[PDB]
Design a protein around this ligand. Sequence first.
Ligand code: AMR
Length: 245
Amino acid sequence: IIGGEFTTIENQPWFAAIYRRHRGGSVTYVCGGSLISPCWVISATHCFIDYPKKEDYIVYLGRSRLNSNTQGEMKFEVENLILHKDYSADTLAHHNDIALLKIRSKEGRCAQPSRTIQTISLPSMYNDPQFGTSCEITGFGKENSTDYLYPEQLKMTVVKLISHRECQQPHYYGSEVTTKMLCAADPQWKTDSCQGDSGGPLVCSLQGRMTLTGIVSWGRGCALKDKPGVYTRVSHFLPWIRSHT
Ligand SMILES: N=C(N)NC(=O)c1nc(Cl)c(N)nc1N
């Protein structure tokens, strides 16, 4: 997250930190995710497409820091890694960038709700917030394009939803963005999601209710003028989400 502020997991209880195990014992951060139900985490397919091995992933819930433990956090293995069949990636754009991760603890149990661990509501069929609506994003992603390391503390920022028409302009993304995607950015181009924030949530207060409106998917650079963040439109994937869960 470029700009924005440091926050704690208590403020983003549905946030899931996904790591990959390596040979030797070195674990590295992969992407963000969201707890949609006690046993299910939703993320982006591009995060796992190159290494589809469920055994190599570790999902953390209730975690505020990247490389240190947080009181009340819970560790989970991945029981089932469901990637979208029609996933494809063009020059910039990622299509059908959505993934489901069925989680289970060592004891075979799912997530147990607490002050630092909660689920987020999915949207209604084709019912998104009107454009111009403010939404928040969270992640352990880069703070600047020039950084090679990720921030140690979780961050968040607020961005505004941009209409499909505006995002399809020539100077923006043109015909690369589709109706299955959502654009969002800071009107002043100061804050934005970046590398590392992928798979994380785009949360919008819809009709007095926190709703998972999008999943961080792609963008040209980070916080660049006329280059909004692009998110997977959760409302258009409800049939797919329900059929696999
Ligand atoms: N402007 C944005 N919102 N950009 C990104 O979200 C993003 N950028 C880069 Cl450079 C990347 N590797 N992954 C991303 N998800």
